Amino acid sequence: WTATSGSCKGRCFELQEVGPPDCRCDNLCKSYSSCCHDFDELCLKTARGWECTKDRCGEVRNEENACHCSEDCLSRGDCCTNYQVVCKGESHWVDDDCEEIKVPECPAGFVRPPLIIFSVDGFRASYMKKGSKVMPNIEKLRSCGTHAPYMRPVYPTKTFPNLYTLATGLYPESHGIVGNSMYDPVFDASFHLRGREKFNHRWWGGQPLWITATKQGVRAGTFFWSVSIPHERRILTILQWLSLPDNERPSVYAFYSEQPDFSGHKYGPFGPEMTNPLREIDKTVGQLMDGLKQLRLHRCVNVIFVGDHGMEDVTCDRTEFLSNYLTNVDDITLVPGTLGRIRAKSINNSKYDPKTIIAALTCKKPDQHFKPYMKQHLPKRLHYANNRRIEDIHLLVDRRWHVARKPLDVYKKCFFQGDHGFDNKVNSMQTVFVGYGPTFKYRTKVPPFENIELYNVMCDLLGLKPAPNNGTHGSLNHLLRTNTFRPTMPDEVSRPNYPGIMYLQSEFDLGCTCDDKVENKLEELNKRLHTKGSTKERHLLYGRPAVLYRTSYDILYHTDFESGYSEIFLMPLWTSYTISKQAEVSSIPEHLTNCVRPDVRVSPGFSQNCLAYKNDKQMSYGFLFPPYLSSSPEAKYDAFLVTNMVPMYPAFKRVWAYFQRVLVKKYASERNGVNVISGPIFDYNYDGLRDTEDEIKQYVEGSSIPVPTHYYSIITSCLDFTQPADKCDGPLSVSSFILPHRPDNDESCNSSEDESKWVEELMKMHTARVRDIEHLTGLDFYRKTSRSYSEILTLKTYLHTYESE
Ligand SMILES: *[C@@H]1O[C@H](CO)[C@@H](O[C@@H]2O[C@H](CO)[C@@H](O[C@@H]3O[C@H](CO[C@H]4O[C@H](CO)[C@@H](O)[C@H](O[C@H]5O[C@H](CO)[C@@H](O)[C@H](O)[C@@H]5O[C@H]5O[C@H](CO)[C@@H](O)[C@H](O)[C@@H]5O)[C@@H]4O)[C@@H](O)[C@H](O[C@H]4O[C@H](CO)[C@@H](O)[C@H](O)[C@@H]4O[C@H]4O[C@H](CO)[C@@H](O)[C@H](O)[C@@H]4O)[C@@H]3O)[C@H](O)[C@H]2NC(C)=O)[C@H](O)[C@H]1NC(C)=O
Ligand SMILES: Cc1nnn(Cc2cc(C(F)(F)F)ccc2CCC(=O)N2CCN(S(=O)(=O)c3ccc(S(N)(=O)=O)cc3)CC2)n1
Ligand SMILES: [Ca+2]
Ligand SMILES: [Cl-]
Ligand SMILES: [K+]
Ligand SMILES: [Zn+2]
């Protein structure tokens, strides 16, 4: 109950919301049908429109008017945005030459520059170029401030997941808004776009920017706007709040536009009808900047122009129907559209098997426009698994397509020509970022970055300490003139051992044989020095990674590679090696095909054995430093050490072998050498974080050799590809991946063909940031470079996406 008999006289858009049954006058009241009787009259005035005209100039203050052209208006702080233009001969902000803002030029009493976030739904990255003739205000911001070519959203590329990721710096899996539709099985509740359950605070995890601000003594303007409140009134309210007394005035504000997303759904991303929504957004931006300039705040305030996601061409004829794959289509529930989530309709039905459902959706048509997944097999870059609200079965839908349950759902519910929600690496889903103001840089292009990073930056812009989040704080320091956060390297927790020769061949009973019984003081002293670390400068280019958890490990040196060997997991955590442009691939000789050799620096009890692999019919084994790239027949023996061995399913070996035999050399040619660091990953609980020993669900049969869920590689070279990887004076270039370690290749529908037609394609899909790999291994890479740490942080968040321009 709301007793709406109270009034909004003097309370219009109040910043502290009052509790029922008292009526409300805040900018959300409309959405809860709880405004006071007079809210429309007093707070949503529209009389005489939104602009001063010559004849209104100097008028008598009429309080009924939407905005005022009277003489007193400036001091009341309620002029129309164009008042000084029309009535005082000033220019519009867009017509002024832009001039560097080296320091905040703010009115007295302002304790910090305010931050205004102008968020636009569906603003696809390519509109900045393609709509440039009709968006002059936005184009001034972009060219005079700091901008990226695009900003990467989070998956799913839907509105609520992305706006709340912008607000918190969290992946949807961690903040809880994992879609626009959701079911929580612990609550036994459903979250929808329509209706009231979305207003319950239990859905919304983490700490959004406005609560972070409030808690640390920074006043926040309320971020949300009810849909019926027109844009012009949202702007005027923000400008009103900026006129307030120093002790009541907020330091951070948000504007939200439902365009261009709303139109984009009807007319498609580039429909001729889309020009007009872009004109109107630009007009609104123009009103803000004109308003700020009136208040002498235009060289004081930091303005962020940011989108949540883009828009793709999607029509009703491009729908895949689960009814054309599943006989049992009525026993499931489908969250449909640009992604698919499948659970059982009834939890009482114990004859619901997700495996047979997955199998019925796998490679069944030759052009199939979706791929099903257990959520824990989704690419790790999506971070879309560790939440009870995300269904075990997921469908990644091809760009331009939909998935529905049955045809009746598509015609009983063609209307739309645009949609979004696809994989966040897809170009059409990319969105925008511009930063403009004293704390941002002048006329600066920055590289593409992910929207998870902005929460930290907005905290920095407001002098706030950010709540724990998934940004990498410091990775966007290059956007800022000052206010930068100065990060330190995390301290190494476990120092390594450096074992020498401590064991005789005969102490090992591994069941491993090798054809290596063949016999010199020139090449004996020389090989010792390789085992003590003479070529380590060659193979470990960026320092050894730091282990950031408590564990027991050994650094092992060799001619061609260097490893940090875990005595706990009985395999390397990492293997580092460099392949120059001119290095040569060789084969595995016939005498060494099944050769595995004891490592005399590591005890039998901390080594693997071959009998485990013999007795495990499912599990085979592979190598982290590839024998294929040994530098000499003598060096090749080092690659067959038991300490270079890792468990591999025969299906994964096809992948690994192709990567090691062909691709590594291919990349070395194309990039002028590469440093490679490869290793195992264990994420049985799919939280994106290194598992402890006691979380490992699978061992090689009859042993304590744990089985990785994934294998990673980090491939680094010189950004200036004229210089070789091993002699690079400048910025680095990196690409990486996290391959799921799977016993079949069902993910790759063309896997029965030659590895040259699908392997590289699989790797692309499972491309990763170094930072992803850090979370999963508890390692810290690039500890010793000649580069700044911020630059390295930027490099660690880089994702190689494999999309075109
Ligand atoms: C992205 O960044 C985020 C943010 O930094 C990272 O997530 C953090 O990971 C931490 C490590 O896993 C995690 O720390 C745990 O916190 C537990 C207390 O959590 C509450 O308090 C925080 C702080 O205010 C709050 O934010 C939490 O909110 C979560 O949960 C509610 C649901 O109840 C949601 O509303 C909210 O959206 C959020 O959900 C997300 O996180 C939870 C996990 O916290 C997931 O389950 C969800 O799926 C969702 O992703 C909470 O209200 C604390 O209890 C944990 O401690 C246990 O484990 C330690 C290990 O050291 C052990 O020693 C302790 O004994 C303890 O175990 C006890 O409970 C066990 C299970 O019941 C039991 O086995 C034991 O026997 C014990 O009884 C732990 O310290 C932190 O909460 C989250 N934070 C967030 C916001 O998600 C994330 O890792 C980053 N991602 C990547 C890839 O880097
Ligand atoms: C979603 C979402 N998550 N965070 N935001 C705030 C946000 C964040 C940014 C930023 F991160 F800075 F970029 C910019 C602009 C906005 C405003 C977005 C907006 O005005 N709308 C329209 C209104 N609704 S609503 O569904 O009616 C609704 C009402 C109340 C609640 S509650 N329970 O939190 O009180 C929840 C939903 C959400 C979308 N929206
Ligand atoms: Ca884990
Ligand atoms: Cl959804
Ligand atoms: K085997
Ligand atoms: Zn939309």
Side-chain angles (χ1 to χ4, degrees), residues 499-503 505 508 510 531 556-558 563 565 597-604 607 638 640-644:
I501 300 179
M502 298 153 59
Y503 295 103
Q505 177 66 23
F508 294 87
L510 306 183
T531 309
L556 308 177
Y557 297 115
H558 325 69
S563 73
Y565 180 84
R597 309 167 55 226
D599 194 333
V600 302
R601 307 164 288 191
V602 189
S603 75
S607 300
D638 300 354
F640 299 104
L641 288 170
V642 71
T643 56
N644 190 42

PDB file of all heavy atoms in Angstrom, residues 499-503 505 508 510 531 556-558 563 565 597-604 607 638 640-644:
ATOM      1  N   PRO A 499      66.997 -28.209  -7.753  1.00  0.00           N
ATOM      2  CA  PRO A 499      67.640 -29.505  -7.547  1.00  0.00           C
ATOM      3  C   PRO A 499      68.724 -29.809  -8.574  1.00  0.00           C
ATOM      4  O   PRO A 499      68.575 -29.480  -9.756  1.00  0.00           O
ATOM      5  CB  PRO A 499      66.481 -30.492  -7.711  1.00  0.00           C
ATOM      6  CG  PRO A 499      65.572 -29.808  -8.670  1.00  0.00           C
ATOM      7  CD  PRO A 499      65.608 -28.378  -8.223  1.00  0.00           C
ATOM      8  N   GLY A 500      69.819 -30.391  -8.092  1.00  0.00           N
ATOM      9  CA  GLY A 500      70.846 -30.952  -8.937  1.00  0.00           C
ATOM     10  C   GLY A 500      70.605 -32.443  -9.016  1.00  0.00           C
ATOM     11  O   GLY A 500      69.548 -32.932  -8.634  1.00  0.00           O
ATOM     12  N   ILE A 501      71.618 -33.167  -9.462  1.00  0.00           N
ATOM     13  CA  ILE A 501      71.534 -34.614  -9.693  1.00  0.00           C
ATOM     14  C   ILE A 501      71.562 -35.393  -8.364  1.00  0.00           C
ATOM     15  O   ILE A 501      72.591 -35.451  -7.704  1.00  0.00           O
ATOM     16  CB  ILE A 501      72.686 -35.053 -10.620  1.00  0.00           C
ATOM     17  CG1 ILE A 501      72.569 -34.315 -11.975  1.00  0.00           C
ATOM     18  CG2 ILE A 501      72.679 -36.562 -10.787  1.00  0.00           C
ATOM     19  CD1 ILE A 501      73.661 -34.642 -12.988  1.00  0.00           C
ATOM     20  N   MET A 502      70.432 -35.979  -7.969  1.00  0.00           N
ATOM     21  CA  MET A 502      70.286 -36.584  -6.627  1.00  0.00           C
ATOM     22  C   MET A 502      69.814 -38.031  -6.620  1.00  0.00           C
ATOM     23  O   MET A 502      69.593 -38.580  -5.549  1.00  0.00           O
ATOM     24  CB  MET A 502      69.302 -35.746  -5.784  1.00  0.00           C
ATOM     25  CG  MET A 502      69.739 -34.306  -5.524  1.00  0.00           C
ATOM     26  SD  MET A 502      68.332 -33.204  -5.271  1.00  0.00           S
ATOM     27  CE  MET A 502      67.561 -33.994  -3.854  1.00  0.00           C
ATOM     28  N   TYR A 503      69.643 -38.644  -7.793  1.00  0.00           N
ATOM     29  CA  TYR A 503      69.007 -39.955  -7.906  1.00  0.00           C
ATOM     30  C   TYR A 503      69.644 -40.757  -9.017  1.00  0.00           C
ATOM     31  O   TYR A 503      70.005 -40.210 -10.051  1.00  0.00           O
ATOM     32  CB  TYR A 503      67.510 -39.809  -8.167  1.00  0.00           C
ATOM     33  CG  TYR A 503      66.797 -39.172  -7.002  1.00  0.00           C
ATOM     34  CD1 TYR A 503      66.402 -37.835  -7.028  1.00  0.00           C
ATOM     35  CD2 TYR A 503      66.573 -39.895  -5.838  1.00  0.00           C
ATOM     36  CE1 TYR A 503      65.777 -37.264  -5.927  1.00  0.00           C
ATOM     37  CE2 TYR A 503      65.954 -39.322  -4.738  1.00  0.00           C
ATOM     38  CZ  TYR A 503      65.561 -38.019  -4.791  1.00  0.00           C
ATOM     39  OH  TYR A 503      64.947 -37.501  -3.688  1.00  0.00           O
ATOM     40  N   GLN A 505      69.424 -43.821 -11.842  1.00  0.00           N
ATOM     41  CA  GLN A 505      68.482 -44.469 -12.761  1.00  0.00           C
ATOM     42  C   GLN A 505      67.726 -45.621 -12.093  1.00  0.00           C
ATOM     43  O   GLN A 505      66.498 -45.676 -12.123  1.00  0.00           O
ATOM     44  CB  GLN A 505      69.276 -44.983 -13.965  1.00  0.00           C
ATOM     45  CG  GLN A 505      68.501 -45.758 -15.024  1.00  0.00           C
ATOM     46  CD  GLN A 505      67.487 -44.915 -15.772  1.00  0.00           C
ATOM     47  OE1 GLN A 505      67.603 -43.695 -15.831  1.00  0.00           O
ATOM     48  NE2 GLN A 505      66.487 -45.569 -16.354  1.00  0.00           N
ATOM     49  N   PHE A 508      64.407 -45.645  -9.857  1.00  0.00           N
ATOM     50  CA  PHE A 508      63.105 -45.434 -10.484  1.00  0.00           C
ATOM     51  C   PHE A 508      62.502 -46.754 -10.942  1.00  0.00           C
ATOM     52  O   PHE A 508      63.175 -47.540 -11.613  1.00  0.00           O
ATOM     53  CB  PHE A 508      63.247 -44.491 -11.671  1.00  0.00           C
ATOM     54  CG  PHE A 508      63.653 -43.120 -11.278  1.00  0.00           C
ATOM     55  CD1 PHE A 508      64.990 -42.791 -11.145  1.00  0.00           C
ATOM     56  CD2 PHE A 508      62.692 -42.151 -11.017  1.00  0.00           C
ATOM     57  CE1 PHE A 508      65.361 -41.513 -10.779  1.00  0.00           C
ATOM     58  CE2 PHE A 508      63.057 -40.868 -10.651  1.00  0.00           C
ATOM     59  CZ  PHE A 508      64.386 -40.545 -10.536  1.00  0.00           C
ATOM     60  N   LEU A 510      59.285 -46.971 -12.799  1.00  0.00           N
ATOM     61  CA  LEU A 510      58.187 -46.279 -13.427  1.00  0.00           C
ATOM     62  C   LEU A 510      57.486 -47.139 -14.474  1.00  0.00           C
ATOM     63  O   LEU A 510      56.334 -46.867 -14.815  1.00  0.00           O
ATOM     64  CB  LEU A 510      58.698 -44.992 -14.083  1.00  0.00           C
ATOM     65  CG  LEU A 510      59.488 -43.993 -13.222  1.00  0.00           C
ATOM     66  CD1 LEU A 510      59.825 -42.768 -14.058  1.00  0.00           C
ATOM     67  CD2 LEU A 510      58.765 -43.600 -11.929  1.00  0.00           C
ATOM     68  N   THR A 531      72.052 -27.608 -17.968  1.00  0.00           N
ATOM     69  CA  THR A 531      71.322 -28.073 -16.757  1.00  0.00           C
ATOM     70  C   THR A 531      71.484 -27.162 -15.505  1.00  0.00           C
ATOM     71  O   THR A 531      70.756 -27.351 -14.524  1.00  0.00           O
ATOM     72  CB  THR A 531      71.719 -29.543 -16.385  1.00  0.00           C
ATOM     73  OG1 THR A 531      71.594 -30.388 -17.534  1.00  0.00           O
ATOM     74  CG2 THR A 531      70.845 -30.128 -15.258  1.00  0.00           C
ATOM     75  N   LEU A 556      63.506 -26.433 -13.297  1.00  0.00           N
ATOM     76  CA  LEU A 556      64.333 -27.396 -14.035  1.00  0.00           C
ATOM     77  C   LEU A 556      64.837 -26.739 -15.325  1.00  0.00           C
ATOM     78  O   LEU A 556      64.032 -26.263 -16.131  1.00  0.00           O
ATOM     79  CB  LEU A 556      63.541 -28.656 -14.363  1.00  0.00           C
ATOM     80  CG  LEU A 556      62.829 -29.321 -13.188  1.00  0.00           C
ATOM     81  CD1 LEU A 556      62.028 -30.529 -13.663  1.00  0.00           C
ATOM     82  CD2 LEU A 556      63.793 -29.733 -12.092  1.00  0.00           C
ATOM     83  N   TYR A 557      66.163 -26.703 -15.486  1.00  0.00           N
ATOM     84  CA  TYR A 557      66.819 -26.120 -16.658  1.00  0.00           C
ATOM     85  C   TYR A 557      67.153 -27.190 -17.685  1.00  0.00           C
ATOM     86  O   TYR A 557      67.422 -28.345 -17.340  1.00  0.00           O
ATOM     87  CB  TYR A 557      68.105 -25.382 -16.269  1.00  0.00           C
ATOM     88  CG  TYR A 557      67.900 -24.194 -15.355  1.00  0.00           C
ATOM     89  CD1 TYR A 557      68.412 -24.188 -14.049  1.00  0.00           C
ATOM     90  CD2 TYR A 557      67.207 -23.063 -15.790  1.00  0.00           C
ATOM     91  CE1 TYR A 557      68.238 -23.096 -13.203  1.00  0.00           C
ATOM     92  CE2 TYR A 557      67.028 -21.967 -14.947  1.00  0.00           C
ATOM     93  CZ  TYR A 557      67.546 -21.987 -13.661  1.00  0.00           C
ATOM     94  OH  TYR A 557      67.374 -20.910 -12.829  1.00  0.00           O
ATOM     95  N   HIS A 558      67.099 -26.784 -18.952  1.00  0.00           N
ATOM     96  CA  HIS A 558      67.482 -27.597 -20.106  1.00  0.00           C
ATOM     97  C   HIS A 558      67.934 -26.694 -21.253  1.00  0.00           C
ATOM     98  O   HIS A 558      67.687 -25.486 -21.260  1.00  0.00           O
ATOM     99  CB  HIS A 558      66.341 -28.470 -20.630  1.00  0.00           C
ATOM    100  CG  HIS A 558      65.414 -29.007 -19.582  1.00  0.00           C
ATOM    101  ND1 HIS A 558      64.557 -28.205 -18.861  1.00  0.00           N
ATOM    102  CD2 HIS A 558      65.165 -30.272 -19.179  1.00  0.00           C
ATOM    103  CE1 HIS A 558      63.828 -28.950 -18.052  1.00  0.00           C
ATOM    104  NE2 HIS A 558      64.177 -30.211 -18.227  1.00  0.00           N
ATOM    105  N   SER A 563      61.326 -25.269 -16.927  1.00  0.00           N
ATOM    106  CA  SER A 563      60.043 -25.560 -16.279  1.00  0.00           C
ATOM    107  C   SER A 563      60.065 -25.319 -14.768  1.00  0.00           C
ATOM    108  O   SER A 563      61.107 -25.423 -14.145  1.00  0.00           O
ATOM    109  CB  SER A 563      59.616 -27.001 -16.585  1.00  0.00           C
ATOM    110  OG  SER A 563      60.400 -27.941 -15.873  1.00  0.00           O
ATOM    111  N   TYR A 565      58.487 -27.254 -11.967  1.00  0.00           N
ATOM    112  CA  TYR A 565      57.860 -28.559 -11.746  1.00  0.00           C
ATOM    113  C   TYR A 565      57.187 -28.700 -10.366  1.00  0.00           C
ATOM    114  O   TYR A 565      57.821 -28.522  -9.344  1.00  0.00           O
ATOM    115  CB  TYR A 565      58.896 -29.669 -11.988  1.00  0.00           C
ATOM    116  CG  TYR A 565      58.342 -31.062 -11.787  1.00  0.00           C
ATOM    117  CD1 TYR A 565      57.661 -31.717 -12.814  1.00  0.00           C
ATOM    118  CD2 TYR A 565      58.481 -31.710 -10.557  1.00  0.00           C
ATOM    119  CE1 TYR A 565      57.138 -32.985 -12.620  1.00  0.00           C
ATOM    120  CE2 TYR A 565      57.958 -32.973 -10.349  1.00  0.00           C
ATOM    121  CZ  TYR A 565      57.299 -33.609 -11.383  1.00  0.00           C
ATOM    122  OH  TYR A 565      56.792 -34.857 -11.176  1.00  0.00           O
ATOM    123  N   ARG A 597      61.892 -41.044 -19.845  1.00  0.00           N
ATOM    124  CA  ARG A 597      63.165 -41.178 -19.118  1.00  0.00           C
ATOM    125  C   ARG A 597      63.057 -40.598 -17.710  1.00  0.00           C
ATOM    126  O   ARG A 597      62.530 -39.506 -17.536  1.00  0.00           O
ATOM    127  CB  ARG A 597      64.288 -40.406 -19.819  1.00  0.00           C
ATOM    128  CG  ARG A 597      64.480 -40.672 -21.303  1.00  0.00           C
ATOM    129  CD  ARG A 597      65.395 -39.627 -21.934  1.00  0.00           C
ATOM    130  NE  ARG A 597      66.695 -39.536 -21.245  1.00  0.00           N
ATOM    131  CZ  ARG A 597      67.321 -38.414 -20.866  1.00  0.00           C
ATOM    132  NH1 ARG A 597      66.818 -37.210 -21.098  1.00  0.00           N
ATOM    133  NH2 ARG A 597      68.492 -38.496 -20.246  1.00  0.00           N
ATOM    134  N   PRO A 598      63.589 -41.307 -16.703  1.00  0.00           N
ATOM    135  CA  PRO A 598      63.667 -40.733 -15.362  1.00  0.00           C
ATOM    136  C   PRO A 598      64.437 -39.426 -15.306  1.00  0.00           C
ATOM    137  O   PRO A 598      65.428 -39.286 -15.992  1.00  0.00           O
ATOM    138  CB  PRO A 598      64.430 -41.791 -14.582  1.00  0.00           C
ATOM    139  CG  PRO A 598      64.054 -43.062 -15.246  1.00  0.00           C
ATOM    140  CD  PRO A 598      63.963 -42.729 -16.706  1.00  0.00           C
ATOM    141  N   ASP A 599      63.970 -38.482 -14.494  1.00  0.00           N
ATOM    142  CA  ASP A 599      64.681 -37.239 -14.287  1.00  0.00           C
ATOM    143  C   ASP A 599      65.426 -37.395 -12.975  1.00  0.00           C
ATOM    144  O   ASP A 599      64.822 -37.579 -11.915  1.00  0.00           O
ATOM    145  CB  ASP A 599      63.698 -36.079 -14.248  1.00  0.00           C
ATOM    146  CG  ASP A 599      64.374 -34.721 -14.368  1.00  0.00           C
ATOM    147  OD1 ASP A 599      65.560 -34.583 -13.987  1.00  0.00           O
ATOM    148  OD2 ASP A 599      63.697 -33.782 -14.853  1.00  0.00           O
ATOM    149  N   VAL A 600      66.744 -37.324 -13.052  1.00  0.00           N
ATOM    150  CA  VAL A 600      67.614 -37.630 -11.910  1.00  0.00           C
ATOM    151  C   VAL A 600      67.670 -36.515 -10.860  1.00  0.00           C
ATOM    152  O   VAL A 600      68.326 -36.669  -9.828  1.00  0.00           O
ATOM    153  CB  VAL A 600      69.034 -38.087 -12.367  1.00  0.00           C
ATOM    154  CG1 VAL A 600      68.916 -39.314 -13.271  1.00  0.00           C
ATOM    155  CG2 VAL A 600      69.836 -37.002 -13.088  1.00  0.00           C
ATOM    156  N   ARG A 601      66.985 -35.402 -11.124  1.00  0.00           N
ATOM    157  CA  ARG A 601      66.866 -34.308 -10.169  1.00  0.00           C
ATOM    158  C   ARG A 601      65.578 -34.383  -9.350  1.00  0.00           C
ATOM    159  O   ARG A 601      65.396 -33.573  -8.444  1.00  0.00           O
ATOM    160  CB  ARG A 601      66.888 -32.956 -10.897  1.00  0.00           C
ATOM    161  CG  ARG A 601      68.054 -32.721 -11.835  1.00  0.00           C
ATOM    162  CD  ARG A 601      67.797 -31.549 -12.786  1.00  0.00           C
ATOM    163  NE  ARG A 601      66.796 -31.879 -13.798  1.00  0.00           N
ATOM    164  CZ  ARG A 601      66.509 -31.144 -14.877  1.00  0.00           C
ATOM    165  NH1 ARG A 601      67.117 -29.978 -15.112  1.00  0.00           N
ATOM    166  NH2 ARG A 601      65.579 -31.561 -15.732  1.00  0.00           N
ATOM    167  N   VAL A 602      64.688 -35.326  -9.662  1.00  0.00           N
ATOM    168  CA  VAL A 602      63.377 -35.399  -8.989  1.00  0.00           C
ATOM    169  C   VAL A 602      63.124 -36.814  -8.526  1.00  0.00           C
ATOM    170  O   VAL A 602      63.253 -37.732  -9.322  1.00  0.00           O
ATOM    171  CB  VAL A 602      62.217 -34.966  -9.919  1.00  0.00           C
ATOM    172  CG1 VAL A 602      60.923 -34.852  -9.127  1.00  0.00           C
ATOM    173  CG2 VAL A 602      62.545 -33.641 -10.587  1.00  0.00           C
ATOM    174  N   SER A 603      62.727 -36.981  -7.264  1.00  0.00           N
ATOM    175  CA  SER A 603      62.570 -38.316  -6.669  1.00  0.00           C
ATOM    176  C   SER A 603      61.501 -39.147  -7.383  1.00  0.00           C
ATOM    177  O   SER A 603      60.539 -38.578  -7.889  1.00  0.00           O
ATOM    178  CB  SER A 603      62.198 -38.221  -5.186  1.00  0.00           C
ATOM    179  OG  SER A 603      60.855 -37.835  -5.027  1.00  0.00           O
ATOM    180  N   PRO A 604      61.663 -40.493  -7.406  1.00  0.00           N
ATOM    181  CA  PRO A 604      60.595 -41.401  -7.866  1.00  0.00           C
ATOM    182  C   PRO A 604      59.211 -41.023  -7.325  1.00  0.00           C
ATOM    183  O   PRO A 604      58.249 -40.961  -8.089  1.00  0.00           O
ATOM    184  CB  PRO A 604      61.019 -42.764  -7.298  1.00  0.00           C
ATOM    185  CG  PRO A 604      62.495 -42.683  -7.148  1.00  0.00           C
ATOM    186  CD  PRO A 604      62.878 -41.238  -7.003  1.00  0.00           C
ATOM    187  N   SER A 607      57.439 -38.174  -9.030  1.00  0.00           N
ATOM    188  CA  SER A 607      57.407 -38.317 -10.484  1.00  0.00           C
ATOM    189  C   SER A 607      56.170 -39.112 -10.881  1.00  0.00           C
ATOM    190  O   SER A 607      55.575 -39.802 -10.060  1.00  0.00           O
ATOM    191  CB  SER A 607      58.664 -39.018 -10.989  1.00  0.00           C
ATOM    192  OG  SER A 607      59.832 -38.281 -10.653  1.00  0.00           O
ATOM    193  N   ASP A 638      66.096 -34.631 -23.640  1.00  0.00           N
ATOM    194  CA  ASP A 638      65.486 -33.807 -22.581  1.00  0.00           C
ATOM    195  C   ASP A 638      63.975 -33.722 -22.690  1.00  0.00           C
ATOM    196  O   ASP A 638      63.296 -33.710 -21.670  1.00  0.00           O
ATOM    197  CB  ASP A 638      66.047 -32.369 -22.591  1.00  0.00           C
ATOM    198  CG  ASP A 638      67.556 -32.315 -22.368  1.00  0.00           C
ATOM    199  OD1 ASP A 638      68.146 -33.369 -22.086  1.00  0.00           O
ATOM    200  OD2 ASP A 638      68.147 -31.218 -22.456  1.00  0.00           O
ATOM    201  N   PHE A 640      61.877 -35.970 -23.525  1.00  0.00           N
ATOM    202  CA  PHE A 640      61.239 -37.200 -23.105  1.00  0.00           C
ATOM    203  C   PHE A 640      61.376 -37.478 -21.613  1.00  0.00           C
ATOM    204  O   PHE A 640      60.952 -38.538 -21.133  1.00  0.00           O
ATOM    205  CB  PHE A 640      61.771 -38.359 -23.932  1.00  0.00           C
ATOM    206  CG  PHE A 640      61.491 -38.210 -25.390  1.00  0.00           C
ATOM    207  CD1 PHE A 640      62.492 -37.840 -26.275  1.00  0.00           C
ATOM    208  CD2 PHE A 640      60.198 -38.409 -25.887  1.00  0.00           C
ATOM    209  CE1 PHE A 640      62.216 -37.697 -27.633  1.00  0.00           C
ATOM    210  CE2 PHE A 640      59.921 -38.266 -27.244  1.00  0.00           C
ATOM    211  CZ  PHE A 640      60.933 -37.908 -28.112  1.00  0.00           C
ATOM    212  N   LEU A 641      61.923 -36.519 -20.866  1.00  0.00           N
ATOM    213  CA  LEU A 641      61.942 -36.624 -19.412  1.00  0.00           C
ATOM    214  C   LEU A 641      60.533 -36.755 -18.852  1.00  0.00           C
ATOM    215  O   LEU A 641      59.585 -36.136 -19.332  1.00  0.00           O
ATOM    216  CB  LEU A 641      62.616 -35.403 -18.788  1.00  0.00           C
ATOM    217  CG  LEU A 641      64.124 -35.305 -18.965  1.00  0.00           C
ATOM    218  CD1 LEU A 641      64.568 -33.931 -18.512  1.00  0.00           C
ATOM    219  CD2 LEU A 641      64.833 -36.391 -18.175  1.00  0.00           C
ATOM    220  N   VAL A 642      60.421 -37.549 -17.808  1.00  0.00           N
ATOM    221  CA  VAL A 642      59.163 -37.812 -17.137  1.00  0.00           C
ATOM    222  C   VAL A 642      58.565 -36.544 -16.540  1.00  0.00           C
ATOM    223  O   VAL A 642      57.355 -36.461 -16.349  1.00  0.00           O
ATOM    224  CB  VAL A 642      59.380 -38.867 -16.033  1.00  0.00           C
ATOM    225  CG1 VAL A 642      60.169 -38.288 -14.861  1.00  0.00           C
ATOM    226  CG2 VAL A 642      58.063 -39.462 -15.567  1.00  0.00           C
ATOM    227  N   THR A 643      59.423 -35.568 -16.241  1.00  0.00           N
ATOM    228  CA  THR A 643      58.995 -34.280 -15.748  1.00  0.00           C
ATOM    229  C   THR A 643      58.462 -33.291 -16.820  1.00  0.00           C
ATOM    230  O   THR A 643      58.042 -32.199 -16.464  1.00  0.00           O
ATOM    231  CB  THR A 643      60.143 -33.621 -14.965  1.00  0.00           C
ATOM    232  OG1 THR A 643      61.298 -33.528 -15.803  1.00  0.00           O
ATOM    233  CG2 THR A 643      60.471 -34.439 -13.729  1.00  0.00           C
ATOM    234  N   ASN A 644      58.502 -33.658 -18.104  1.00  0.00           N
ATOM    235  CA  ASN A 644      57.927 -32.865 -19.190  1.00  0.00           C
ATOM    236  C   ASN A 644      56.575 -33.468 -19.643  1.00  0.00           C
ATOM    237  O   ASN A 644      55.971 -32.975 -20.574  1.00  0.00           O
ATOM    238  CB  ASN A 644      58.914 -32.836 -20.361  1.00  0.00           C
ATOM    239  CG  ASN A 644      58.526 -31.832 -21.473  1.00  0.00           C
ATOM    240  OD1 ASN A 644      58.089 -30.703 -21.206  1.00  0.00           O
ATOM    241  ND2 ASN A 644      58.726 -32.235 -22.726  1.00  0.00           N
TER     242      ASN A 644
END
